[PDB]
């Protein structure tokens, strides 16, 4: 029975995790900087607190742009790699499964503080096969070096090939009417990254590798993602993101969610989210291919009554994930404000809770971990909070 295989068990072993967001991914004027977006430097204590809270995994998005020497070698500045190495091993010290990647290098929108510097350019790769070739060489050289640095680190360290690749229009643009050209290239980049990771030798030969689809959208993934040919069986996982529905979870234009909410995104609640998880479960988990959410979340609310809807959202979706053998990592950017972009629940320097962050963390983790067979989507649903409208 493929859903009962070792790879899906490894997928589930990541449980509910946490992103060191706006940290090694932060960047401006063409260069990443750990503190560049207001977060202070991570410490062992950061990761200790994560393990203590019950997270099983941690994702350290890294933006490499600015620390890459010239072609043809694309040498990564050693200090930058040292710091990545160092963090990965702090996480290992705390008993966490660890994910690293190529992050804002691939940022595909126009709203960037590093305009002109995103070498990982999907429109430009589609535009010409020559520029597609340069990008592939750079992806190769970068993954070879990362692989070589971590050759003695085992399957507790996961590599995620790319982040959220796109053309600016978030999966509503030319990708829907170019005859699959954008999707074909992205699949080719994943292939090239997997090739390079495996060629790094050592424990990279049997390391789990996460591969995304277009803009990390679950549906565009199930429709167009082609899993790369691999040198070993059962060592690829599908990476997806979800902040659905965005205007509730991300922008906080609406502040309630689900069947008991009144201030809701219209017609988009419990059924839609589980439908999305079911398509992933039928496409991948049922076929022995693990899926994880590299990023999921909902921002913090100003009122206690709206916050209860946030906890409800977490309890419900995280249970639905558990039951579909899907693991997931919460997006934490360190920002303690409420509303738009207010994702911070754990301090990035100390690993202590920010504001009421503990309730959210407990909500997502406990719901996923719960092994009481009476605790179901029905019971969670029936205890949805009361609308304050
Ligand atoms: O605060 C200073 C800088 O913030 C930058 O915005 C970032 C958000 O604060 C962050 O939460 C968001 O996270 C992304 C994630 O990186 C991505 O993989 C996924 O697709 O969506 C998440 C949630 O949107 O990233 C943005 C930037 O990409 C500003 O860009 C910057 O100008 C500002 O100084």
Author numbering: 9 to 397
Paper text:
AC2aCel5A is an endo-acting cellulase that is encoded within the first reported cellulolytic PUL, originating from an uncultured Bacteroidetes phylotype. The enzyme displays the typical (β/α)8 barrel structure associated with the GH5 family. This allowed identification of the conserved catalytic residues, i.e. Glu172 and Glu303, acting as the catalytic acid and nucleophile/base, respectively.
The roles of Glu172 and Glu303 as catalytic residues were confirmed by site-directed mutagenesis experiments, showing that AC2aCel5A_EE172A and AC2aCel5A_EE303A were both inactive in the standard carboxymethylcellulose (CMC) assay. Co-crystallization of the E172A mutant with cellotetraose resulted in the complex structure solved to 2.4 Å resolution, with two molecules in the asymmetric unit. Additional electron density was observed in the active-site cleft of molecule A, and was refined as a cellotriose molecule bound to the −3 to −1 subsites. Even though the ligand density appears to fit a cellotriose molecule, it is likely that a cellotetraose molecule is present in the complex as the enzyme only produces dimers from cellotetraose. The observed cellotriose density could reflect three glucose moieties of a tetramer, where the fourth moiety could be positioned in the putative −4 position and be disordered. The glucose moiety bound in the −1 subsite is stabilized by hydrogen bonding from its O2 group to the catalytic Glu303 residue, as well as the strictly conserved Asn171. Unlike the sugars bound in the −2 and −1 subsites, the sugar bound in the −3 subsite involves no hydrogen bonds between the ligand and the protein. Its binding seems to be mediated by stacking interactions with Trp45. Superposition of the native structure on the cellotriose complex placed a carboxyl oxygen of the catalytic acid, Glu172, at 1.7 Å of O1 of the glucose bound in the −1 subsite.
